[PDB]
């Protein structure tokens, strides 16, 4: 037995916080957590303690360490079928990879709503607050590959699997409420143009290349979330603090074939935060899965991801009210023209069990909607319709990709389609086509209706001749990145000039960077030529002399589309470094612990070693990871208590750690002795707004910490960082 | 509701006689018929009535007649989800067919030892006569596709997947005892030249062409099977009245560790039973799915198919003792040198549900053994063994093929080895290799033991230099045909001489028909002869004095490789035709009907049209079918009854049926005025042996005919047919 | 060497009668038939003759008919690459075949017009009668599988690819004028009934049984081109002798904008000719191969089908 | 098999050989090269046999394996050699 006689190779089922134990498989973590969806699972789910190792034909292997070879340094036969059949498996092991959204992280969790919405829709999961439905929801980039990195600037996906009792709905959306073109026969040109370029194939999970810009230059339709990309909406910290949009107008339809317009959305219960850029990239090399990770753990801890569903909804008689077309993906509806109306919560509160199974094998797919909802005709939304089927053959390898566990309706679903590669289901019925008589007809179609009706198309009136032109309503491209600039802080607005300067920077033809900055000043004068600055370029007369867009319905900036406007940060499921030395302060670390503990925020013991060192009553502080190996970038604010700091005092990765911490705005604490730190980040003597310090780790240096926390960044730092080199 | 209100549209539950009801799905047929494996395919049998109809996602369809369009005369819309979910799928129906024995037709059934055989294997499923091992089974021509008639000369497979508590246990055989080629390296060569022509693929299911008999002439290792394919093995009346082999020597292994050399065989306790050339081809256009249709009958009609499992076994110590190398799948063994001693029997009683699912996709290899049976160096078998699971990878479109239903283990089955398209399993073990620590090394390796231990290979000593080379034991190629023809009847003589004349005829290119002319005055010189003067070919002086290959261990001849020396007849099953007229002799119908319902020997009634007729006393007489619709050769007898015999006496087809089923040898009965057919058939006053003639058809008519049917067809009619234009 | 002295084993490459001669892939038989897709596919032709055996790695192979063994009575070692490439070329020979047509038998061959159609249509195959268009034709059965039998009672198909010099066009064809459904919303329920029954996949190349007239009984749009395959229609004598439709109304676009509606017809040059059922169900069973055969040999013949 | 789509992966343009390539093998997804050998099997007399066989020499010569002398029992066992 090579297990340890201790059992501690076995992570505990129960809650434990980030670090505390190994990670597992859900069912093996949270045994106990229970759905629906996770349920009907159950029949394809594998153990493995006390059984024998077999061939996939059920035969028990003797030797699981050799070959069979004629002699023991003989050649190997052919006829040893379990080493063939061992290897023909691996050599098989994987599928190609989505073709956008490639690098993602799911979970399970459930959805309920609100109220009954039976007045605007009649689908049926949306119909009582006591109907729970279970979901599954990958978060994804978009550029990348599998293997490339989390936290790199792009917009992120957030797709929603709903398993309803009227079929499953899948809500595919993104953390960004337009997308970059109007018609999706551009797709493969623009998704082509961020991609990593065709002869060499870089850069991988970067846009900031000489194609991407390119395109963007001869496409204006893509600024608006251009502007979006390049603000700090590009870098979210965590899936959990990010918001998700479908995008596209959509229909709600009544049980009285009554449509409503409507766009969805996703709010984040934790709030909105966001990296800085220089943190980001550092953490795709320091830890490519951060978001990933992070995601996990959370849930490991029970700091379950929560979301609000919401709704903007207009009457169908609104549908020119505006000025911009309600069908155009490149523009958004602001708030404060359409509110979004609160109408569920969805909490992800069950890791899978096998990644490549249920995460890898899982489809989405915008097409997926049911009785009670239909599409409008937004262009971009009519050709998604096309990709999504089509994609699965050859990624999950045939029409029966609905048989795969993770995607199976878990509502009864039965029709006459037989037979295509890796068929699952054996169908009984006499009959493989209607209208038939040697079954009497079954299954059978369903009228529509208000309740477990078939479904019927909302019946919109189509009145044109058949063109390939955009509608000259959809021809506006500035008013709403202008909306976006206006409607930001100015750190955001500062931290989108660098986006755009660093991003142009890496463009290698100077005249491509030339076309950018003159599209930026069709948006905004300051904008256009505080990124001309960057860049070494001058602004023409002509230039600066462009007549800005109009405003968007008389809104001069809506402070829903910050990030930081509205304050409404959470700090439970967040993260502290603690640097210790070989001596701490006891007293401090009881404060600290105690405080994070009340508001749920959780602690890393960093020190110079692995190991344990002693604090000063005795006391064994276990420690989870070197200054090296847990750098400031996983954390969200660093605390370093009194003790014998001589002993870190001129540690390089300490300083560096604080150095680290301070460029990137976060919130630092220093308690006793600790203050000798003070000259390492050249804090003036009597103090700074964003660093926390006091003689000791009482509880008002913690409260200071934890309000420094809830406030995410220290933005007023901004000025002071140009000066430290770090 | 489509359905008749009366109900007749659905098969009763129970046995019924071929044609008395619609077929239908086995689970629908035979719903009490039940084995573990059938029952473990409970989980994906999907059933249809009273359930709605849906999208694969499971959302209810209002209209399943029309796509969605612009107007009800407009163009279709890319909106509709719905036609592209139902037209994708039929878009991806079709999987590659097997590369060889594409055609083919399967049933479950179930297989029970007759004693314990632990003295000479420890393999699970012979070890106790209680033990009863699910199977399916698949019998199938080699050379037509999927598409191609059942009825064609050519070898036939019979595979049978045996699911052991032990594993799977696949037995891949043929219905010949030996093969065409001797090292698994001419395989493709050996198939591409039997398989139709590269550049305008003909022909179909036939080896009758050129590329054959070109490789056959060059390859005399070929002429053995050959013998047999050209004999009235290669066209069998049924797949119930034909042997199997599994052609290699295998080995058993017993607890002790001792291994015993094993051929293995399968008895059909229906008899040994084929058709004649003409009809068969004749048959492969009136019912191309004659051998399949009648399989799914007998069972539907519970004439289950009932084969007894036997074994040639040799001593280790005797693998020398032969004339031939045991190792060579050229030579049989013959059971006059070692007997066939019975192992056990196997009973095929239940239909699949879906042919596709179950038949389509299942997968055999003969590398899949259990511990208790081992292979040996065999050059053809040694190259199956690789064989086997490369093709699935293409075929049924990955690694995890045995997930589909069919091919599952029902005994438990854990390994490290994960993800490849269609992955079915979730498997929850925290490690995917061993050794770990991380779940104590589970699932575990398995000492080999007596009962339930890991396999181990037998450790065979092997010493030689690496070679491409063919033994020289293996070098000798007529003695064995030579075997096979002396041991057959005159009358399976001629029909082996008709063979090869057919065959060669069809051989384009003239040189070629004397260069197997040639090969076969090698064998035997009164076979050459009497092909080459059906080719018009004369021997040269060296062939008529080319010496005869020796006789095998002293055998001059080996009755066990004849299909009609030993009487073996069972007429249970079998199918007479009865020629109606429209006043037939109720009292002779009555007698007919009853006696062979009580030897179990299904009657079909036909007439000059469908509907009804009204016998003398008013009985109303249901048809089955025209006299063309369904011809004589799809029947073993024909009896016509007396009555108003004139009504069919200038009826051309019914004439046309009794000179067919004169010609091919078929019992014919006459009762009263219908020996006025006698004319039509030429028969003479006082009669002839093969046809019964009286009065009426009380007495011993039937006796004699069931008698006639017993013992299958009218050999001594042969010299009699030559001058009937039939 | 394997071949006879007197030469007989190869084809004259000079037109023969069906039979004289064993038939020959096309650029044996007639080296000097060309035309632009011909000689295009010239870049992947491979000969053989004169050429070394090799591995598809260009190694030339010593013995191929023999795996390489401990021994000449030994086990088969894994490290025989030559065994192991050959036999995975064979296992994965087989693709998919058609969902529907899946039967056929196909000749290339040119197109030219009588006279310039600019008029009506601005397509450039149509432009000029000296302008010849290759084309490649397949005619196929629709129920059963790729090994099924030729004579069977079926429509038939009998599709055209175009190769203009303005793009692929290809006609995609029927031998009736009319199809058995209205909207492609039932195809898959069509042709599921027509084809063998999913519980025991009988019966081959055959309407004839109860799933087809089930359909057809509950669904008369279906009666028009039921009528037809139950004619003589549904037995050509040979693919030479049944006429073709492309059953759709087409637009025709010339180059001032008008729109004409269009129905496409083939005229076989050969005559309309059927067999007669006795006689068509019983070469299923002679000569599954038969129109197969009679296309193959009547173009080695010289006897080429025509079309207008 | 699966990553380049079936058993012409060698027809693919940089996987190609420069060297002549012919043999019996035919078919398989993606089939690029057209055959007119009109035997597509060996021994065969239609095509005078060819391709050919060509036995092992100094140079252009048949691959024969060299002739390892092999020697013991079929065994799944490591050499303690190599422990
Ligand atoms: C080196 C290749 C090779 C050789 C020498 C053989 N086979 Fe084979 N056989 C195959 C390669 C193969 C295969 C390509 O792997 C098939 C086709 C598809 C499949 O699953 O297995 C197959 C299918 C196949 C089937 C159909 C199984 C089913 O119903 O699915 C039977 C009954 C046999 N074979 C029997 C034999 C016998 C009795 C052989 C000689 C003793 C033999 N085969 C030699
Ligand atoms: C509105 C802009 C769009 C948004 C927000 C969007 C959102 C997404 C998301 C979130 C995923 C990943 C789902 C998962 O987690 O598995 C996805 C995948 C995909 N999308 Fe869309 N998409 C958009 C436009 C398009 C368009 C216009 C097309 C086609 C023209 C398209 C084709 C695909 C394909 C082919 C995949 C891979 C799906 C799979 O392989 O299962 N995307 N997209
Ligand atoms: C109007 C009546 C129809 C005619 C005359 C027609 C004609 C044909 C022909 C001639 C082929 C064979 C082409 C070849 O030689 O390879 C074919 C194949 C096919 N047809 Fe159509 N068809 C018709 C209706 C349809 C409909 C309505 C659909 C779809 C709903 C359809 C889907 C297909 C498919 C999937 C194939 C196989 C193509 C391939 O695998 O390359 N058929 N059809």
Not at 220 to 228: A, D, G, Q, R, S
Not at 695 to 717: C, K, P
Request: charged share 25%; aromatic share 10%; with cysteine.
């Amino acid at each position: 037995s090579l297990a340890p006689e201790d059992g501690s190779h076995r992570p505990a089922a129960e809650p434990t916080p980030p670090g505390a134990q190994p990670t597992a498989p859900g069912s093996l973590k949270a045994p106990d957590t229970r759905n629906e969806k996770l349920n009907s699972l159950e029949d394809v789910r594998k153990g493995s303690e006390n059984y024998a190792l077999t061939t996939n034909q059920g035969v028990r292997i003797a030797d699981d360490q050799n070959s069979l070879r004629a002699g023991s340094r003989g050649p190997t036969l052919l006829e040893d079928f379990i080493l063939r059949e061992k290897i023909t498996h691996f050599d098989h092991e994987r599928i190609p990879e989505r073709i956008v959204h490639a690098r993602g992280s799911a979970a399970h969790g459930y959805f309920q709503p609100y109220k009954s919405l039976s007045d605007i829709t009649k689908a049926d999961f949306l119909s009582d607050p006591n109907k729970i439905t279970p979901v599954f929801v990958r978060f994804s980039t978009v550029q990348g590959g599998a293997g490339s990195a989390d936290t790199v600037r792009d917009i992120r996906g957030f797709a929603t699997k709903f398993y309803t009792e009227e079929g499953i709905f899948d809500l595919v959306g993104n953390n960004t409420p337009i997308f970059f073109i109007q018609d999706a026969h551009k797709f493969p040109d623009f998704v082509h143009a961020v991609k990593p370029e065709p002869h060499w194939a870089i850069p991988q999970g970067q846009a900031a290349h000489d194609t991407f810009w390119d395109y963007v230059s001869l496409q204006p339709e893509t600024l608006h979330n251009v502007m979006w990309a390049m603000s700090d909406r590009g870098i979210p910290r965590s899936y959990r603090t990010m918001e998700g949009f479908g995008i596209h107008t959509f229909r709600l339809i009544n049980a009285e074939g009554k449509a409503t317009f409507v766009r969805f959305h996703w709010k984040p219960l934790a709030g909105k935060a966001s990296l800085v850029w220089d943190e980001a990239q550092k953490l795709t090399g320091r830890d490519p899965d951060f978001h990933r990770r992070e995601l996990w753990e959370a849930i490991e801890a029970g700091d379950f991801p929560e979301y609000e569903l919401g709704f903007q909804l207009i009457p169908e008689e609104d549908e020119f009210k505006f000025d911009f077309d309600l069908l155009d993906p490149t523009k958004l509806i602001p708030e404060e023209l359409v509110p979004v109306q609160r109408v569920g919560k969805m909490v992800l509160n069950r890791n899978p069990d096998n990644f490549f199974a249920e995460n890898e094998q899982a489809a989405f797919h915008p097409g997926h909607i049911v009785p009670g909802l239909d599409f409008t005709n937004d262009p971009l939304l009519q050709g998604r319709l096309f990709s999504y089927t089509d994609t699965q053959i050859s990624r999950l390898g045939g029409p029966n990709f609905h048989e795969i566990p993770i995607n199976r309706p878990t509502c009864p679903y039965h029709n006459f389609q037989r037979d295509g590669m890796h068929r699952m289901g054996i169908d009984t019925n006499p009959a493989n086509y209607e209208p038939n008589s040697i079954n009497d007809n079954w299954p059978r179609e369903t009228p529509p209706g208000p309740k477990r009706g078939g479904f019927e198309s909302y019946q919109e009136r189509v009145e044109g001749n058949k063109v390939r032109e955009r509608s000259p309503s959809f021809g506006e491209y500035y008013s709403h990145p202008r909306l976006f600039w206006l409607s930001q802080t100015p750190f955001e607005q500062r931290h989108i000039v660098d986006g755009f300067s660093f991003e142009l920077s890496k463009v290698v033809r100077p005249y491509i960077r030339e076309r950018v900055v003159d599209q930026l000043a069709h948006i905004d004068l300051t904008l256009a030529q505080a990124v001309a600055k960057n860049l070494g370029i001058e602004l023409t007369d002509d230039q600066l002399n462009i007549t800005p867009p109009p405003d968007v319905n008389g809104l001069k900036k809506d402070p829903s589309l910050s990030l930081y406007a509205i304050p409404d940060g959470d700090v439970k499921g967040r993260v502290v470094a603690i640097l210790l030395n070989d001596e701490v302060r006891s007293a401090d670390l009881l404060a600290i612990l105690k405080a994070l503990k009340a508001k749920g925020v959780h602690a890393k013991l960093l020190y110079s070693r692995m190991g344990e060192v002693t604090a000063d009553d005795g006391t064994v502080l276990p420690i989870a990871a070197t200054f090296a190996g847990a750098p400031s970038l996983t954390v969200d604010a660093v605390i370093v208590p009194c003790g014998n700091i001589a002993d870190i005092a001129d540690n390089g990765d300490a300083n560096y750690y604080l150095m680290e911490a301070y460029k990137h705005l976060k919130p630092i604490a220093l308690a006793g002795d600790a203050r000798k730190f003070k000259a390492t980040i050249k804090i003036a003597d009597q103090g700074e707004e964003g660093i926390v310090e006091a003689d000791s780790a009482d509880g008002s240096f913690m409260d200071e910490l934890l309000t420094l926390m809830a406030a995410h960044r220290v933005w007023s730092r901004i000025p002071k960082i140009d000066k430290i080199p770090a």
